[PDB]
C-alpha cells in the first residue's frame, strides 16, 4: 500500500550524462551513440543572450572549440550541427553504455524523470509534468541546462525533455530531444512569460482511482454525468477538457476499481462544486494532477524496468 | 531556483539488486561483494510467520534451499548466516558493480532514497523520512521486501533502511542492514500497530528556510519565540519537541537567509495557528516534514555525486 511521487530508477540515463564545455559556458549534455546532444545556448555568453545569432556563433565555432568530458575521460568533437535549439557534438567514441532509446515529443499532461545535473554530474531525480501552459515546476539551478526528462516504456527509455531555461515566475521551459521547444518560448534573453495554467483532468481522475486503490473512497457517489455535462463543469473551474481518448486511457484504472469512468466523473463534478470540506484524498488538501494513468497502474500494480 | 521531493540517483544500488528464493517465497537481496542480504522471513511460509522459530527454521535449510538470481545468471550459495532479522547468503562470486558502501542506522526524522524492488527489478525511486514513530509512509506491495533505503554522499552508497513489513495503518516497518528493526516490531504476523506519529519539527523549520532561499516571504511575522513557548504551542499540533540539538542544526539555513531559528519558529508558530488562507508554500497546502536542514543546502547549493 501507500502512494508516493515515484521517479523511474536513473541507472540507464546516469550512464549518458557527460560535461559540454564551450568558452566559460559549461552545462550537461546527453551521450547516445557517437553524438552528445546539448541546448545551442552553449556557443553563447550571457551577453550573447540578449540578441544571439545562433548559425552566425555556430559557423564561427570549429569541433575543438567544444570540450566534452565523460566522468574524467575526454571525449574528441568530429563535427558539430544544430537541429532546432539543440547542438549535436559528432564524437570519436560511441556511449558503450548507450540503452535502447528513442526521443519522443510528450502531449501537455504526460509525466516523465527528470536526472538534475549539474557538471556531468547527477545531483537527484524527480517527477514533472508537463503543464498544459507548456512549462514544468523543477530544481534547477545555474548550470541544470542539459539535463534530460525520461520515460522508461517497457524495455525502451524514450527522453522527452532538456532543460533550457527558468521564467521569472520560477518555472522550467525546455525542448524535446529534438531541439523543439515546448510552448511559445525563444532561445533568447527577452520578455516571455508563463501563459495561464490550466488542471490536468485526466490526472486527477486518475489520481481518485489511486485513492480509491489505498482505500480512501469518501468522495464517491450514487450520481453519474455524461461526458459533455462533465466537462461543462470542468471548464467552469479551469480544467482541461475531458476527451473519449482519455476516458479510454482510464478503461483499466475503471476495470480494476470496478468504478465507471463517468462515475468517477460524477464524484470530481461534487468536490469541484462543493470542495473537500476540511477533508483530504490520499494526505493532500488539494486535487493531485501530476500522476498520469500510467503511473498510477506502475506504482499500484508494481511494474518493473530490467 | 525551485525546490522538489528529491531522491538520490538509484544506478548504483540498481546494480545491486537479486531475487531471492526459498521454497514458494521470492523477495529481493542486496548483493554486495561476495554477501547477498535479506529478511530472514524469506525462510518462512504464510502459515510460519505467526511464531517462527527462525533458528529451527533456518537450521533445516541447506545452501541449495536458496535460490539467487542476478538477471539470468544463478548465484551459487556456498554459506549462510542469521543477523539478528537478516540472512546474510555466501555467493561463490563477488558483484563486479559493487559500489563504495557503509551500512548505518538513521535517527528518526532522517531522510532516504527508497529503490522499490520486485522479483530482484527496480520499480521506481522515492524519497522517505523515518518517522518519528519508527515507521516509514512508503509505497510497497507485496513482494517488495528486501528493498533497500540509501544516502549517497561523494561516491559512497550508505545503506540505512531494508524493507520487512506492511503495518495495518498502511505504513512499512523495516530493519537497518544489521537486521535490527526501527522500533519496537517484531518479524512476526501478530498484530503490531504503529505508535502516534508526530510531526518533524526541525525538517518543517528546515523547508520553510527553503521557501525563503526560494524567494517567498509571505508567512513571516514581526514575532519571536523562546524554544520553550514554542515547544509548548508546537505539541499542541503534535509536533515534535525542538532541542537546542535542532536549532544549531538549522544554524547554517539562518546563516544564510539572515531569519533566526527562533523567528523562524514564530513564524511555524501562526502558520499551525492560521493555515496557509488559500495559499501555498513551495506548491504544498500542507506543511512539509520529509526535508532535514542538509537535504536543503543539498538541493539549494547543487551538491552532485
Ligand atoms: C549563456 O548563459 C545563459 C544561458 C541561459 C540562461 N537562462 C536564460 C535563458 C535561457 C533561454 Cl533558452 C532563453 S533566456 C536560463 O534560464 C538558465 C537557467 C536555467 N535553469 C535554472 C536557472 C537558474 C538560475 C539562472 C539561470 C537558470 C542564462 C544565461
Ligand atoms: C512469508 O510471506 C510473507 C512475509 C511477510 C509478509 N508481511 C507480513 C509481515 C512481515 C513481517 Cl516482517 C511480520 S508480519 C508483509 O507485510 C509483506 C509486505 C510488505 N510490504 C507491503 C505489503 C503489502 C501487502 C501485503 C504484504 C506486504 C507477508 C507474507
Redesign the interface.
Known sequence: ???????????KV??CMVQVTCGTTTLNGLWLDDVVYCPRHVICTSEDMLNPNYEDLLIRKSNHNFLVQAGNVQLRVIGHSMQNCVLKLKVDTANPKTPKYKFVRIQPGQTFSV?????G??????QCAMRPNFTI?????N??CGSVGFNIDYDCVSFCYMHHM?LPT???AGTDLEGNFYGPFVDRQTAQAAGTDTTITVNVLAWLYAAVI??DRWFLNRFTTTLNDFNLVAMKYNYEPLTQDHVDILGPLSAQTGIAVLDMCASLKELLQNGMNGRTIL????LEDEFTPFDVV?????????
Do not use: I
Request: net charge positive; proline share 4%; charged share 10%.
Open positions: 500500500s501507500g502512494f508516493r511521487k515515484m521517479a523511474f530508477p536513473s541507472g546516469e550512464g536526472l538534475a545535473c549539474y557538471n554530474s547527477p545531483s537527484g531525480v524527480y515546476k523543477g530544481s534547477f539551478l548550470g541544470s527558468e520560477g518555472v522550467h489505498n482505500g494526505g493532500s488538501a488539494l506502475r506504482q499500484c500494480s508494481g511494474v518493473t524496468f530490467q
